[PDB]
């Protein structure tokens, strides 16, 4: 720690001792149902973008590896998460939104972006956490005579708020003369057909879009991925996994009065102080296991290779990863004598150390 | 129906998140009811709709338990999707349809394009029933807390934090809202939320006991 | 604001004003000497036993080594300041058991053996009035492990890697040094600060002090009882002022409050995102793959390094100011207690 | 700019301690002037004979 | 006419506060100290002000430095003429030469150039595409403008932290100089000094 082969007389702060974890704990809710992603990704007909369907996925176990087998898409483009880490952690509820757009407007399905679909048909919030899955549908959603079952809205008085739907079809007016249900001068129907044909270019092809919207853990978890649970142990520094919340610490019983809608307890430093076990409805205190500073008290290497170690700020009955107790921690390797000399190496609250004669050894004194 | 005006009296605070915090002052920016405002006292002995303007604080000091249910929407004549929260003695029935229904007149104790059918435990139950409704990012959140009152004069002095009930992600473009009655009178307060900044205080038991509205007077800005 | 009362001294070219009496006044000056010694390690603060964060933190060079060196230098300098102010006498003088000094009462400043920490009465009020922040110089990890009532600020400081080191000289040794200086002052005069301590009666020492300020020594011997009574009344007034008014000790309270507030700010700075998606490191590890979590971890590491360097720079400036005040206090100890000063307002 | 303020809110309390440091310097300047000049307790004045 | 530098400083959030004591109050304090020194001597700094003739006060001052007081009383007009001539030479030197007050001018100039640098530093890009927030917010979408605004925020925050640190160091130096000035006020004006070159 000094980047030298010879050290001088004094006390040096070298490193910190940490108690390493022994076991591992995974706590997941006892849910055995399977989430129906096959009903979402494999459907005969998909709804239009102005009337997009929303499916609630809850009270099941979600496996995200079968999504690649269900549909032939390229990119599992996620925003708040990664596609490879979806099976470890878990959420409260998952919503799946399915619609069909043109290949030009696939790029508009993104947080914080304007256009035609993104303003009048389907708007995503700025705090969107989820994945957008899109693939070509030229073999099922294309006809040589054209497609008129897929409608999109391009005329509206105001921009759409996120996660909003519009079903009502009125005669749009862009002038002082009222339409009164008559599609005449300056009166337009807001819905017009896409008109999909197989002979179009690659940017005008029909695309099937499935938007998976995850919401983070605030409620008790109802959908969680495939991961086996482990029995809970207490009063030991272990690694825990409480509904995707990883960490290391000691789990003890607590007298904290959690209100029934609260599943977490935070601290001033924005760290989880207490947790609620998902299997048995009990409150557990999370505290890190024992640490502290290590100071090495040495004379020079020209004198001796003997050292004494001071474990700072601990009551050393829990030492490992002559014994004398000071106010600056406790001293291991120096013999406390009932004498008083001048201070040579300052340790703590009135305690010094020296290399004396009365066989050479390291002593401690006041 | 008869209208009146009365003071808010530092009332209408709710828990902003489901996180236990104890013995700490926390700063939150959320749609809150501002302190010392005028809520409107409606005396229902008689009815145009009330505008849903960025959140509604609902209160009722009625012991006889007459008030029941709400309607949400924007035009309410089968040209829009309308939220309908109907409560009874057993469940609640929350639904979104075009909804040319009615339960306001004397038809009581002596569909279309449906999206969801959430039924659950009932919401309602010298007592004050405080309610907060809001619509953020397409999500409808309902907060509630019942508190007994000793002297039935007006809204009480003190703090009583509101606890969340449900977080419905349905309900689109709410502009106007309506409240039912019940006959074999009804009096309720209506306040309007505002994007204010609060400074909440938690005790050693994790309960909100005091709060400071940061944009009320310069002393509260100094405190914040 | 009013600058003061208007006065007009009657000047004339043949008129002089000469005093016919005197008063003996005892005033109180309070000077800070040392401050809190702190020790911060980067791995608990920035990372919190995350191996990926530590591996990314090793690429930032030796910022933490020089921050640690600066904090260690400040901690050594505090003990040097206390030793250089208080340990000015070479021997531990003691007052003889006969407590007669010409009629002067020194009972409220001399120590008493009734209490275990041999401090005087005025020292007991000065220790009681300045409240302490109760930092980590007392071991509290057994108390921090046992969750009682609510979480303390000191436990949140300690769990994030902030630790307060105890001073080298305890309060009993400081009181012993003060008692040795006081006994050498009242039994020897100024002779103990310039060699061996030569005894002298206290009335004759006070006559020497009166000859120092230009008054003939017969004025003391003709007015000894009045001067002793005035000294006793002034000491009692100092006692009553310390018992009643509590705003006099604001400098040492400010010294305690600043060092508490800096560590509280450093703890509260761990809740910031610094442009990342989450202030919690484990959420960044679990929610993302290698590259994106490495980007967010780099943002958090950068923000925590700027916060830590800001804390260290503020501590260095405060330590320089405290060292200047300690040098002034050591000069005042050498010139006021160990001698008689002719400097005006010093 | 509202977006800049919302992104600046995520940086913590750097501006709070910058404001505190500047306020401490400002109080210290007036303390320096009071310590140097306000040493006398009464305002003596010159008699008219010069 | 043209835009001042102080207006450009004030428009960007930089404000200069007035001191608590005005110049008339400092002049009143200086006049009170001068009148107390002339009429009383050093007696006004250690209690009540006792009057004394100024020739007798100067005899006291000569008796302090080891010269017997008959030297003043036999050479009073010569010493008065020498004092008046020396005050006249100080008046002539202050009317002629302007390089003596360079320390206070340096105090003014440092505080001017620090605020000028803080204003001029706002033109920097810090690796972004522009130094203007409105051009970034109008030219890009949400994510890219967030990245560029974050770069500009980091650069401006670093510059402001540098300014505050330099101001703290300068304030420590100014406080040391003010402590020396207070000591010289207490020891040269309110009394007589035995210290060499003080
Ligand atoms: C000098 O002042 C002292 C007080 O500081 C005077 O002592 C007081 O004298 C009066 C008159 O007899 C007594 O009633 C008081 O009890 C005395 N106070 C004491 C002794 O503390 C003293 O008389 C003054 N001397 C002269 C010459 O005026
Ligand atoms: C899960 O476990 C808890 C306690 O062991 C039990 O009360 C609950 O019924 C279980 N749930 C299921 C679905 O088995
Ligand atoms: C989709 O469902 C139909 C009906 O069950 C089935 O015939 C078809 O094979 C499914 N497609 C895939 C890719 O599994
Ligand atoms: C903590 O240290 C004190 C002082 O040495 C000791 O009395 C006490 O027993 C220790 N606590 C333990 C060992 O749990
Ligand atoms: C609330 O509004 C009513 C409507 O006129 C008004 O009379 C009352 O004074 C208002 N309350 C205030 C301003 O506190
Ligand atoms: C916390 O709850 C306990 C349990 O009844 C109670 O004794 C105590 O007074 C409460 N503390 C408060 C309200 O501050
Ligand atoms: C001395 O003072 C008196 C009155 O104060 C004055 O008349 C006289 O001229 C003064 N002496 C001299 C030499 O000016
Ligand atoms: C003054 O000295 C006497 C001893 O003669 C002592 O009894 C008394 O307590 C002292 N006064 C005070 C206020 O302590």
Report how far the terminal alpha carbons of chain A are from each other: 29 Å
The amount of beta strand of chain A, in percent, is 25-35%
Bound ligands, named by name, code or SMILES = a molecule of 2 linked components (NAG-NAG), 2-acetamido-2-deoxy-beta-D-glucopyranose
- Quaternary structure: part of a larger assembly
Largest interface, by Cβ-Cβ below 8 angstroms: which chains and how many residues each? A-C, 44 and 45 residues
The major β-sheet of chain A equals: 6 strands, mixed
Give the overall silhouette of chain A.
Answer: elongated
What's the SSE pattern of chain A? EEHEHEEHEEEEEEEEEEEEEEEEEEE
Number of helices of chain A: 3
Radius of gyration of chain A: 34 Å
Please give the share of residues in helix of chain A: under 10%
Widest sheet: strand ordering of chain A: 2-12-13-16-15-14
E-strand count of chain A:
24
Structural class of chain A: mainly beta
Protein name (chain D): Spike protein S2
Structure keywords:
five-stranded antiparallel sheet, 5 chains, six-stranded mixed sheet, elongated, 366 residues, binds a molecule of 2 linked components (NAG-NAG), part of a larger assembly, 3 helices, binds 2-acetamido-2-deoxy-beta-D-glucopyranose, mainly beta, 3% helix
Molecular structure report:
The structure is cut from a larger assembly and holds five copies of chain A. Chain A is mainly β. Helix content of chain A is 3%, strand content 32%. In chain A, strand 22 and strand 23 (352-356) form a beta hairpin. Chain A starts with 9 loop residues before the first strand and ends with a strand. Chains A and C meet through strand 1, strand 13 and strand 17 of A and helix 3, helix 5, helix 6 and helix 12 of C. Strand 1 of chain C pairs parallel with strand 1 of chain D. One 2-acetamido-2-deoxy-beta-D-glucopyranose is lined by residues 5, 38 of chain B. Chain C: This is Spike protein S2. Chain C: The record marks 119-120 as: Cleavage. Chain C: Residues 132-157 are annotated as: Disordered. Chain C: Residues 120-141 are annotated as: Fusion peptide 1.
């Amino acid at each position: 720690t000094l980047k030298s082969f010879t050290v001088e007389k004094g006390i040096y702060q070298t490193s910190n001792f940490r108690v390493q974890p022994t076991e591992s704990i995974v706590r997941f809710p006892n849910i055995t149902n399977l989430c129906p992603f096959h009903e979402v990704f494999n459907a005969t007909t998909f709804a239009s973008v102005y009337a997009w369907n929303r499916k609630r996925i809850s009270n099941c176990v979600a496996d995200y590896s079968v999504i690649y087998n269900f549909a032939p898409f390229f990119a599992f483009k996620c925003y708040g998460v990664s596609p490879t880490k979806l099976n470890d952690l878990c959420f409260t509820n998952v919503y799946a939104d399915s619609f069909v757009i043109r290949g030009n407007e696939v790029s508009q399905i993104a947080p914080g972006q304007t256009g035609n679909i993104a303003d009048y048909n389907y708007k995503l919030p700025d705090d969107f956490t989820g994945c957008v899955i899109a693939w070509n549908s030229n073999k099922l959603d294309s006809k040589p005579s054209g497609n008129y079952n897929y409608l999109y809205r391009l005329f509206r008085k105001s921009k759409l708020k996120p996660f909003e739907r519009d079903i009502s079809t009125e005669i749009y007016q862009a002038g002082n003369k009222p339409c009164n249900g008559v599609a005449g001068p300056n009166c337009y129907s807001p819905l017009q057909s896409y008109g999909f044909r197989p002979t179009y270019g690659v940017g005008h092809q029909p695309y099937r879009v499935v938007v998976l919207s995850f919401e983070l853990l605030h409620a008790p978890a109802t959908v969680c991925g495939p991961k086996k649970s482990t029995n809970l142990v207490k009063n030991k520094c272990v690694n825990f996994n409480f509904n995707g919340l990883t960490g290391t610490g000691v789990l003890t019983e607590s007298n904290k009065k959690f209100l029934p809608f609260q599943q977490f307890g935070r601290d001033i430093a924005d760290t989880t102080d207490a947790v609620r076990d998902p299997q048995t409805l009990e409150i557990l205190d999370i505290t890190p296991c024992s640490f502290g500073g290590v100071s090495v008290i040495t004379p020079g290497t020209n004198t001796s290779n003997q050292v004494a170690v001071l474990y700072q700020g601990v009551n050393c009955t829990e030492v490992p990863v002559n014994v004398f107790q000071t106010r600056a921690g406790c001293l291991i390797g120096a013999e406390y004598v009932n004498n008083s000399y001048e201070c040579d190496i300052p340790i703590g609250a009135g305690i010094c150390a020296s290399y004396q004669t009365q066989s050479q050894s390291i002593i401690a004194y006041t | 129906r008869t209208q009146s005006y009365t003071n808010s009296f530092t009332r209408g605070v709710y828990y902003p998140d489901k996180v236990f915090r104890s013995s700490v002052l926390h700063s939150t920016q959320d749609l809150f009811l501002p302190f010392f405002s005028n809520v409107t006292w409606f005396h229902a002995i008689h009815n145009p709709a009330l505008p849903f303007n960025d959140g509604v604080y609902f209160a009722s000091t009625e012991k006889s338990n007459i008030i029941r249910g709400w309607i949400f929407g924007t035009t309410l004549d089968s040209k829009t999707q309308s939220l309908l929260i109907v409560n009874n003695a057993t469940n609640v029935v929350i639904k979104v349809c075009e909804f040319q229904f009615c339960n306001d007149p004397f038809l009581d104790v002596y569909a279309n394009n449906c999206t969801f059918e959430y039924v659950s435990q009932p919401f309602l139950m010298k007592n004050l029933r405080e309610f907060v409704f809001k619509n953020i990012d397409g999500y409808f959140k309902i907060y509630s807390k019942h508190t007994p009152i000793n002297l039935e004069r007006d809204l009480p002095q003190g703090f009583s934090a509101l606890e969340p009930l449900v977080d419905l992600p349905i309900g689109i473009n709410i502009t106007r809202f309506q409240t039912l009655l019940a006959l074999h009178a009804a009096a309720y307060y209506v306040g309007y939320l505002q994007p204010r900044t609060f400074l909440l205080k938690y005790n050693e038991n994790g309960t909100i006991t005091d709060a400071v509205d940061c944009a009320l007077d310069p002393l509260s800005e100094t405190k914040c | 604001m009013s600058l003061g009362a208007e006065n007009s001294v009657a000047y004339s070219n043949n008129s002089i004003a000469i005093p016919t009496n005197f008063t003996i006044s005892v005033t109180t000056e309070i000077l800070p000497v040392s401050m809190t010694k702190t020790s911060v390690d980067c791995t608990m603060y920035i990372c919190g036993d995350s191996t990926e964060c530590s591996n990314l933190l090793l690429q930032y060079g030796s910022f933490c080594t020089q921050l640690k060196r600066a904090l260690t230098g400040i901690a050594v300098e505090q003990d040097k300041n206390t030793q250089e102010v208080f340990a000015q006498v070479k021997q531990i003088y003691k007052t003889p058991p006969i407590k007669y000094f010409g009629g002067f009462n020194f009972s409220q400043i001399l120590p008493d053996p009734s209490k275990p920490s041999k401090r005087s009465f005025i020292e007991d009020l000065l220790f009681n009035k300045v409240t302490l922040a109760d930092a980590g110089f007392i071991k509290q990890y057994g108390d921090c492990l046992g969750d009682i009532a609510a979480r303390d600020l000191i436990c949140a400081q300690k769990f994030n890697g902030l630790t307060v080191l105890p001073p080298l000289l305890t309060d009993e040794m400081i009181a012993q040094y003060t008692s040795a200086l006081l006994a050498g002052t009242i039994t020897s005069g100024w002779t103990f600060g310039a060699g061996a301590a030569l005894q002298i009666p206290f009335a004759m020492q006070m006559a020497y002090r009166f000859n120092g300020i230009g008054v003939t020594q017969n004025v003391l011997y003709e007015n000894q009882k009045l001067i002793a009574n005035q000294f006793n009344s002034a000491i009692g007034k100092i006692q009553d002022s310390l018992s009643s008014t509590a705003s006099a000790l604001g400098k040492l309270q400010d010294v305690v409050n600043h060092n508490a507030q800096a560590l509280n700010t450093l703890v509260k700075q761990l809740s910031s995102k610094f442009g990342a998606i989450s202030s919690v490191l484990n959420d960044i590890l679990s929610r993302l793959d290698k590259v994106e979590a490495e980007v967010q971890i780099d943002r958090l590491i950068t923000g925590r390094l700027q916060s830590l360097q800001t804390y260290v720079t503020q501590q260095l400036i405060r330590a320089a100011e405290i060292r200047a005040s300690a040098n002034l206090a050591a000069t005042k100890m050498s010139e006021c207690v160990l001698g008689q000063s002719k400097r005006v307002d010093f």
